[PDB]
Design a protein around this ligand. Structure first.
Ligand SMILES: *[C@@H]1O[C@H](CO)[C@@H](O[C@@H]2O[C@H](CO)[C@@H](O)[C@H](O)[C@H]2NC(C)=O)[C@H](O)[C@H]1NC(C)=O
Ligand SMILES: *[C@@H]1O[C@H](CO)[C@@H](O[C@@H]2O[C@H](CO)[C@@H](O)[C@H](O)[C@H]2NC(C)=O)[C@H](O)[C@H]1NC(C)=O
Ligand SMILES: *[C@@H]1O[C@H](CO)[C@@H](O)[C@H](O)[C@H]1NC(C)=O
Ligand SMILES: *[C@@H]1O[C@H](CO)[C@@H](O)[C@H](O)[C@H]1NC(C)=O
Ligand SMILES: *[C@@H]1O[C@H](CO)[C@@H](O)[C@H](O)[C@H]1NC(C)=O
Ligand SMILES: *[C@@H]1O[C@H](CO)[C@@H](O)[C@H](O)[C@H]1NC(C)=O
Ligand SMILES: *[C@@H]1O[C@H](CO)[C@@H](O)[C@H](O)[C@H]1NC(C)=O
Ligand SMILES: *[C@@H]1O[C@H](CO)[C@@H](O)[C@H](O)[C@H]1NC(C)=O
Ligand SMILES: *[C@@H]1O[C@H](CO)[C@@H](O)[C@H](O)[C@H]1NC(C)=O
Ligand SMILES: *[C@@H]1O[C@H](CO)[C@@H](O)[C@H](O)[C@H]1NC(C)=O
Ligand SMILES: *[C@@H]1O[C@H](CO)[C@@H](O)[C@H](O)[C@H]1NC(C)=O
Ligand SMILES: *[C@@H]1O[C@H](CO)[C@@H](O)[C@H](O)[C@H]1NC(C)=O
Lengths: 423, 50, 86, 198
């Protein structure tokens, strides 16, 4: 079939009609980014020559190619620790949550560490880790451990969560300044152009929508094996690259045998060197192909890690104004979760809901003066004019305290007559 | 069949006709001893970067 | 260690900032002799959280920090024919 | 070590060139790494065989160099793109992006030229000398719930004030620095105080 680009949606546009949300939902979405790559190390000399002295001596005729290849992989391996550090080690101190999880109804039990488990992972982190060698090693292909263990990364993550929950964004700028969670959320509502009273007057609704959304995340991940495809793809690409590299050792490359020991046991040096030369050329070419692809792939991972580090700073350690940078909707806050060679961001956003039609005007005419809304927009419910905050319907009486005057009524196009109340 | 490594008793279920085995890398990782018909596993001698 | 066998370094329980990375949470430093330790992730800080307590700065400092970025690379030019054949 | 980031670029490229040059000393299976020695000793029919070996080795060495320069160049380009972005957002403006223009609340930045690079001096505002206050989401007065227009309601232990959030500056709570929304029966943690009417 011809693919659909989505459902058609004709917006009810007019020169005097506005839609304003009378409700909202708290949405939590998951963003998964690769941070690190398996730190492989391939011993060039052993890969090509094994323990053969005759081959090793021939390999020296090619100069420093093995030094370059060993160096390139070393550089990659180091980068991988840098990538992890840039993303997770963004906090000066290791912050801890209080023994009493009273956040005004907000429940973070699924993102905070579960103390009953040796790994000290959150319920979600535990799920992420559950969702996402000798044959290689025997050919000189080893794997180096990450500088930071999974337990250290989880500790960084929990520190970031504790900071975010107890001190908002302050700990990401200077000293961690404690603030009640509901009050922190109220600040984040202001950050999206919604008044703080909307938070406080709907605190239980908001806490409930939040708690529900978090619960959905755990279920969504659990029931969707492909959810962590981005991290699994990295694992698969590198495993495939290594497997290919190893399999190349079975190639003759024109030699009488792919087995170096068979050549050496059959032929004298004058003839063995010819057969070995063919294997060295083929195996060096195979190894240069591997390294080149690892450098290119490493660069991609680095870019991903850089993005993850940026999101950690801007989504977790602060509230972002950047559209679609910290999830879909108006960003409130985000919570990092550790994952295998990567990071998972739970983005909490404010999504407008249940909008309704109003008649609108750019200005109100009163006593010959043009009045404009100081913060909100002028709307009519069909009979009466009100001023309301733009992202949440809250119809206030139009007064001199919520409007300002600029010029007369003969300039603004679409200006309507109403009363402006003077307290 | 020559090489260097550590020989141990194998627990691999060789069939009567199979003389040696190979891993996923397609390299010999087991042999049948030509005198005793014992199956031996082959691993490389311990090594690593320094 | 998980990174391998480390010989010549004295392992201690005291955790410090990472100096020379070994791997798997282990770092080494010169303190004199070479020591090995589990790296610290930073000092612990329990925030005095409550449902009605706020901390507000009564002062501030002006901080200047330096960020250094590469912009350009040496513009080399290698004559292929001359390099290979002179 | 302060400029290690720029020195690393210099070192990587110098090393790459030095390696490329040293490859000219490799025989690559030829009787000699010196092309002139091959030519002075052998006739063409045999010289071509020896030269072929040097060409293959030297072309491979050069393709390795170029490939690594392309990859490295891409990294530098990304760094330059970031630097250009910071120039725009940190120097030619004030950034809201956390940790983008230094640690703390960005005020301004000043660029400084460096060898094959740029140095940004980021000037930030860092909160200091915080102290504890009791706080409330709203003040209850005349049955109405009052919320702070800009700041936060705090108590010094006896009296309630409203202050800007990033700097303690305790003002009297008045109708000019609060707004009313609903009654006192909705907000959780609302406290009783007076709201002064000028
Ligand atoms: C705004 O939407 C929320 C739901 O997102 C509404 O709350 C639900 O109300 C129904 C009754 O109509 C209850 O059965 C649900 O349990 C409530 N959900 C939650 C999480 O509490 C809320 O009433 C709506 N507000 C307005 C003004 O429409
Ligand atoms: C926070 O939410 C978790 C669930 O995500 C709550 O834990 C559940 O508590 C009920 C008892 O009320 C148990 O039957 C469930 O088995 C628990 N589930 C899990 C995963 O532990 C937790 O009690 C909530 N915290 C608060 C203060 O309400
Ligand atoms: C606004 O009116 C249009 C018709 O002009 C209608 O299609 C649309 O659904 C209305 N908006 C809402 C929220 O009902
Ligand atoms: C508009 O709001 C006013 C005040 O709440 C109300 O009296 C009036 O009936 C409303 N008009 C309509 C069409 O709902
Ligand atoms: C909207 O368009 C109508 C004509 O269709 C016009 O009479 C009216 O004045 C316009 N209102 C505004 C605000 O432009
Ligand atoms: C508003 O009222 C004035 C009289 O006070 C009248 O002259 C003017 O035309 C009216 N404008 C509109 C849009 O009704
Ligand atoms: C000779 O080899 C056979 C297997 O081919 C074995 O069964 C027999 O015992 C061996 N005899 C001696 C003396 O080793
Ligand atoms: C470190 O602590 C362990 C106990 O867990 C102890 O046995 C060991 O001797 C200590 N090492 C040092 C250097 O104190
Ligand atoms: C606030 O009170 C806590 C004790 O509950 C104390 O540890 C903390 O240092 C106090 N904050 C300041 C700035 O003194
Ligand atoms: C709070 O501030 C008021 C006005 O400055 C002062 O009179 C009062 O003594 C202060 N209370 C405390 C505990 O400092
Ligand atoms: C804070 O918690 C205490 C119980 O420990 C409760 O009595 C008080 O009303 C709560 N205050 C707020 C603002 O939640
Ligand atoms: C505030 O004062 C009113 C009486 O005017 C009282 O009924 C109410 O319970 C008080 N609320 C608090 C939190 O003290």
């Amino acid at each position: 079939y011809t693919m659909s680009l989505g459902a058609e949606n004709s917006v009810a546009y007019s020169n005097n009609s506005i839609a304003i949300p009378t409700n909202f939902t708290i949405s939590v979405t998951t963003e998964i980014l690769p941070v690190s790559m398996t730190k492989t190390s391939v011993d060039c000399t052993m890969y090509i020559c094994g323990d053969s002295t005759e081959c090793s001596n021939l390999l020296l005729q090619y100069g420093s190619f093995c030094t370059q290849l060993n160096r390139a992989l070393t550089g990659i391996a180091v980068e991988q620790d840098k990538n992890t550090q840039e993303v997770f080690a963004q906090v000066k101190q290791i912050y801890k949550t209080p023994p009493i999880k009273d956040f005004g109804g907000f429940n973070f039990s699924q993102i905070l560490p579960d103390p009953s488990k040796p790994s000290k992972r959150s319920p979600i982190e535990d799920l992420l880790f559950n969702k996402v060698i000798c044959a290689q090693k025997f050919n000189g292909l080893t794997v180096l451990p990450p500088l930071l263990t999974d337990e250290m990364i989880a500790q960084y993550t929990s520190a970031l969560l504790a900071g975010t929950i107890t001190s908002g964004w302050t700990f990401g700028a200077g000293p961690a300044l404690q603030i009640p969670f509901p009050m922190q959320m109220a600040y984040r509502f202001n950050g999206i152009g919604v008044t703080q009273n909307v938070l406080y007057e709907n605190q239980k609704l908001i806490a409930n929508q939040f708690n529900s959304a978090i619960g959905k995340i755990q279920d969504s991940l659990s029931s969707t094996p492909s959810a962590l495809g981005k991290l699994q793809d990295v694992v698969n690409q590198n495993a495939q690259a290594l497997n290919t590299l190893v399999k190349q050792l079975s190639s003759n490359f024109g030699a009488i045998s792919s087995v170096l020991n068979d050549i050496l046991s059959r032929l004298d040096p004058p003839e063995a060197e010819v057969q070995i030369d063919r294997l060295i050329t083929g195996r060096l070419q195979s190894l240069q192909t591997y390294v080149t692809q690892q450098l290119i792939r490493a660069a991609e991972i680095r870019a991903s890690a850089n993005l993850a580090a940026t999101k950690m700073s801007e989504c977790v350690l602060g509230q972002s104004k950047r559209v679609d940078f910290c999830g879909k909707g108006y960003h409130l806050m985000s919570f990092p979760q550790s994952a295998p060679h990567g990071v998972v961001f739970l983005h909490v956003t404010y999504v407008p809901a249940q909008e309704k039609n109003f008649t609108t005007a750019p200005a109100i005419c009163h006593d010959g003066k043009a009045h404009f809304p100081r913060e909100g927009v002028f709307v009519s419910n069909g009979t009466h004019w009100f001023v309301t905050q733009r992202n949440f319907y809250e119809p206030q009486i139009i007064t001199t305290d919520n409007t300002f005057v600029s010029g007369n009524c003969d300039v603004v196009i679409g200006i309507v007559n109403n009363t402006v109340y003077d307290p | 069949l020559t090489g260097t490594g550590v020989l141990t008793e194998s627990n691999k279920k060789f069939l009567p006709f199979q003389q040696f085995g190979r891993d996923i890398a397609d390299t010999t990782d087991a042999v049948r001893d030509p005198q005793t018909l014992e199956i031996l596993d082959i691993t490389p001698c311990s090594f690593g970067g320094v | 260690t998980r990174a391998g066998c480390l010989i010549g370094a004295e392992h201690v329980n005291n955790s410090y900032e990472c100096d020379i990375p070994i791997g798997a949470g282990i770092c080494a430093s010169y303190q004199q002799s070479i020591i090995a330790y589990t790296m610290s992730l930073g000092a612990e800080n329990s925030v005095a959280y409550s449902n009605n307590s706020i901390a507000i700065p009564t002062n501030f400092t002006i901080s200047v920090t330096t960020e250094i970025l590469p912009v350009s690379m040496t513009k080399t030019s290698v004559d292929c024919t001359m390099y290979i054949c002179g």
